[PDB]
From a paper:
In order to shed light on this fundamental mechanism, we studied [name] [name] (SaFapR) a transcription factor that senses the levels of malonyl-CoA, a key intermediate in fatty acid biosynthesis, and modulates the expression of genes involved in fatty acid and phospholipid biosynthesis. [name] has been shown to globally repress the expression of the genes from the fap regulon encoding the soluble FASII system as well as two key enzymes that interface this pathway with the synthesis of phospholipid molecules. Like most transcriptional regulators in bacteria, [name] is a homodimeric repressor. Each protomer consists of a N-terminal DNA-binding domain (DBD) harboring a classical helix-turn-helix motif connected through a linker α-helix (αL) to a C-terminal effector-binding domain (EBD).
The crystal structure of full-length SaFapR in the absence of ligands has been obtained in two different crystal forms. Interestingly, in three out of four crystallographically independent protomers the repressor has the same non-productive quaternary arrangement as observed in the structure of malonyl-CoA-bound SaFapR, with helix αL bound to the lateral face of the EBD, strongly suggesting that this compact structure likely represents a conformation of the protein in solution. However, the helix-turn-helix motifs display high temperature factors or even partial disorder, and are engaged in extensive crystal contacts, suggesting the coexistence of alternative conformational states in solution characterized by flexible DBDs. Similarly to other homodimeric proteins studied by single-molecule or NMR relaxation approaches, our crystallographic studies suggest that the two conformational states of SaFapR (i.e. with EBD-bound or EBD-detached DBDs) can be populated in the ligand-free repressor species.
Residue numbers in the entry:
A (entry chain A), B (entry chain A), C (entry chain A), D (entry chain A), E (entry chain A), F (entry chain A): 6 to 189
The structure:
Amino acid sequence: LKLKKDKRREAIRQQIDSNPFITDHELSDLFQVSIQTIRLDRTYLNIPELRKRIKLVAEKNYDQISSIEEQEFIGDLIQVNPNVKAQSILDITSDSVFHKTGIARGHVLFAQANSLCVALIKQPTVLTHESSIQFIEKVKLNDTVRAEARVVNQTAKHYYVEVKSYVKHTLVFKGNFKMFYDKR
Amino acid sequence: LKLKKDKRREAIRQQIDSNPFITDHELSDLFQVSIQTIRLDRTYLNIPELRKRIKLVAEKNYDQISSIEEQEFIGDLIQVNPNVKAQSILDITSDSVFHKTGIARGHVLFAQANSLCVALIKQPTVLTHESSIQFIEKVKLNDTVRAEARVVNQTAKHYYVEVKSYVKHTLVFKGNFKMFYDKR
Amino acid sequence: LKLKKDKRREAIRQQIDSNPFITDHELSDLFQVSIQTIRLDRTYLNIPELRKRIKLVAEKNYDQISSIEEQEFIGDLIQVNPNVKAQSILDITSDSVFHKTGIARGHVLFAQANSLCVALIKQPTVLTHESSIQFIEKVKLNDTVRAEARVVNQTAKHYYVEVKSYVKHTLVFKGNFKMFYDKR
Amino acid sequence: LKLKKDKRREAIRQQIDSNPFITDHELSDLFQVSIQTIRLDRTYLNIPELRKRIKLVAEKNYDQISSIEEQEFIGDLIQVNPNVKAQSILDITSDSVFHKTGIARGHVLFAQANSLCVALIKQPTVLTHESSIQFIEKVKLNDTVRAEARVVNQTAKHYYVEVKSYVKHTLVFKGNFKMFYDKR
Amino acid sequence: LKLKKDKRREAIRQQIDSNPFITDHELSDLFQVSIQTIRLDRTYLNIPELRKRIKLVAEKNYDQISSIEEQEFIGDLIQVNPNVKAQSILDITSDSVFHKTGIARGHVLFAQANSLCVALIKQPTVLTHESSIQFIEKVKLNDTVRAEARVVNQTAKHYYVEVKSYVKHTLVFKGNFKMFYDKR
Amino acid sequence: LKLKKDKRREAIRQQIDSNPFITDHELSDLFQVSIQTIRLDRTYLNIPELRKRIKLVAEKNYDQISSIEEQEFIGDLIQVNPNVKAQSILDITSDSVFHKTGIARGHVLFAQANSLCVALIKQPTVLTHESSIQFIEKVKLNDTVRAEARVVNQTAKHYYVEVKSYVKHTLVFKGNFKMFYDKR
Ligand SMILES: [Zn+2]
Ligand SMILES: [Zn+2]
Ligand SMILES: [Zn+2]
Ligand SMILES: [Zn+2]
Ligand SMILES: [Zn+2]
Ligand SMILES: [Zn+2]
Ligand SMILES: [Zn+2]
Ligand SMILES: [Zn+2]
Ligand SMILES: [Zn+2]
Ligand SMILES: [Zn+2]
Ligand SMILES: [Zn+2]
Ligand SMILES: [Zn+2]
Ligand SMILES: [Zn+2]
Ligand SMILES: [Zn+2]
Ligand SMILES: [Zn+2]
Ligand SMILES: [Zn+2]
Ligand SMILES: [Zn+2]
Ligand SMILES: [Zn+2]
Ligand SMILES: [Zn+2]
Ligand SMILES: [Zn+2]
Ligand SMILES: [Zn+2]
Ligand SMILES: [Zn+2]
Ligand SMILES: [Zn+2]
Ligand SMILES: [Zn+2]
Ligand SMILES: [Zn+2]
Ligand SMILES: [Zn+2]
Ligand SMILES: [Zn+2]
Ligand SMILES: [Zn+2]
Ligand SMILES: [Zn+2]
Ligand SMILES: [Zn+2]
């Protein structure tokens, strides 16, 4: 048997506090309850929908970055520790897919990744010098790609950044980035 | 001393017949004559401007390709030998540059290259699986990037394609692409 | 009395197999059941909504045509027998109506029809030479117009094509088209 | 020999007073003088370029019409005698041509014509009921099409309007329009 | 206890007849019944949604005004007594808000107000000469602002117009406008 | 008589060093020499055109401001002393004028002014509370409006800012702004 409405809702607040980015689908699977029930529950709880929460959190992050302007950034910058790590979320719309197939275009995922690497480095001048990438799974129209970047090495002239991207906890894309920086 | 008007113009026709894509700047340097003189000369000769000639030639090429639709293609497909080699030209407009610097965004050059590799392979299904790329020189607002792709290996399941890109005969970008294909 | 849920759903699959383009409204009228019930039923059946099915089928058709490029085509090409007959579907949006009245603009329906005639003829060069048309009923904002073209005569230099267009099986527009063609 | 600068310029003012829509090319042919000389002459004379003059005159005309809103009108309404005759000018841009050929799309010329017929009739409700049209010459990218409409018959319920369209005094398109009207 | 369905619906028709612009939220508060119940009720009653009714009424009003063109008007002109008073409604979309905060930009509310003052004056030439304005409350993304303009003085050369703007009967913006007019 | 080419050009560099925003028209009037001569001179001198220089200088200024995002700013921020004074330049395009007349819309000039006041104040939260404005001269299509803002009073809760706007050193618009600020 299932939780009483009240306890389901308490549990839903705890989940979202704990993961500000948890989806309604994830919440429905967790509590084994229709995706519509999740919506009514959030409404009752005064928790805004995922898009909004995502946009609220990201807005604060563009203040921490200096290499690229907010409106140039690809995706939503959900997390950033300058010079250490960062994450973005990007929805795949028809602009981003091949028209015959609905398969996401490679350069879109590369763009999300490259942008994130530029953004996480706290320098005036930050350019990508080299990159090698692997497209591990097809990404489809309407997917949401979470990219996660981290610095793996830092020399005097470069940062080496690894990016891994996911669609529902499935690794879809991996890349290595060699980033140049100077005090200018 | 310089060529008489008549002989300069004869020589200009021969050059363009010989390179349909030669620029007015290249023609001015060749004959050491203002870029405006080149224009008057072409007008007299009934040779259309570079943009037009480029668009006339490319139009015929989209007929030879099957992996990607014409209007999805990045740049102008100036040359194509299906399954062997191909070339595109792409102008760098403000859409393609970082706003602070006028430096072309990495994903734009990668997009030109990735598109070209997809286009040159004559299969129904063609996906990029892996890529490694080097950004050799900064590309600037208003540059024109010529990308040149060639197949270097072909196995039963993949084509390996090398792309090299230029701005006025200067190598600016290099990439290796691992492309998947099947009969579907 | 009405069909049990199970039998209604079986019957709904049979209908859609039989007419890939049947609407939810048509399905609701058939089974005398709310338009929302139809939606839940399709969801259960794993049958995508009308827009999608329409776009899946049409995508395959642009491969058969050569006179006009896919992205220039007006409406969705749902059916094509080159040089014989063809059909398109076109939604009437605010772009297509007079602003004071919501009445569809004449040139929009003519455009759907003219495009279809160009598309169905399998020649490199296909131009419309003459046309006579009758606007039989007002088409309104949000209507969907199904145009149906067929060749009625073929001489050495022309095809004569008749187009008839409908909104819910009501004839709204009729046209005769005199089409030129050559091997060029 | 040619006219002195002064007399050429006097003659140019007289021409434009006499035809507010005469082009610089027409003026150059008339006086056998480069198209650039015509420009310098107009500048000296304080006569604005063709586009402007066209837009100044047309602006006054939308006040006389009631069947269609100004911003819905196709082309520039250069002349109007409500219920009798009217004319528009329309530039053919890339939006209006087939992409492979630069040939103007049929529905564009039909749209100019149909709009003009709706505009010239001074009634609240004016709908096109029937039309037959002939595409007499190919219209190309960058052409300017002058459409000329006149009422040929008027019954109690309809106006019969003939439209003829030109590119440099060459008849390119002809149409007959059966227009419905009522007091509503 | 609450009204029977039938009587609620009768009462809802009377309300909308009486205020063509009453919202579903207002109707839900009145009858203490979910906003969704209001929707089902209107559907049953054949009363179109607020957006439509608003657009139907406003369409008739642009005929009465002469100083500014319909498509230039900011908001929907719901009410107009030329030279006396007028009202508009304007939705606040992301175009109209600061990006960090969702707060409506001042010039948007000023634009609604200034447009309304120009529109209500029945003269060929009508220009704003002076204005003083007070932003009384923050307007937020997705609010709907009702602006209400009235002439308070009229001299030989000017009209003095007061505008007051509201979001759910809360005064949010107030302005005084000094408007110039002549017979030209 | 006029300056030798060499001395004219020396003098032109000195002028632009001295006023980075001086126009070619201003330079032509100064040296009484065609606007085209000015262009050739700048080309020779390696001084970029006005648009570019303006965009280079402004780019550096958005770094100093915190109340409004760069891409939301109306016009180009050519000068800024946070909490003291600032200036913008704004071109008047067809988007900004009444369609019948080419006269700039009031809210456009108010927008330039209001944006500048928000931008110059170095606080997280900065809102306009009150404003009174005078439209002193008609601004026309293609004019360039220079707005100049300065703080005239500062209390604990507000800044009082005066804006004056010009087209070729002619005062066209004046405004007083009451701005709210807090540490949030
Ligand atoms: Zn998750
Ligand atoms: Zn699941
Ligand atoms: Zn397609
Ligand atoms: Zn892209
Ligand atoms: Zn490096
Ligand atoms: Zn070259
Ligand atoms: Zn050179
Ligand atoms: Zn910038
Ligand atoms: Zn891009
Ligand atoms: Zn592979
Ligand atoms: Zn049907
Ligand atoms: Zn029905
Ligand atoms: Zn309207
Ligand atoms: Zn159209
Ligand atoms: Zn023919
Ligand atoms: Zn003529
Ligand atoms: Zn000629
Ligand atoms: Zn094409
Ligand atoms: Zn069209
Ligand atoms: Zn009739
Ligand atoms: Zn109310
Ligand atoms: Zn309430
Ligand atoms: Zn922002
Ligand atoms: Zn605005
Ligand atoms: Zn005044
Ligand atoms: Zn100056
Ligand atoms: Zn001057
Ligand atoms: Zn107008
Ligand atoms: Zn505006
Ligand atoms: Zn205050």
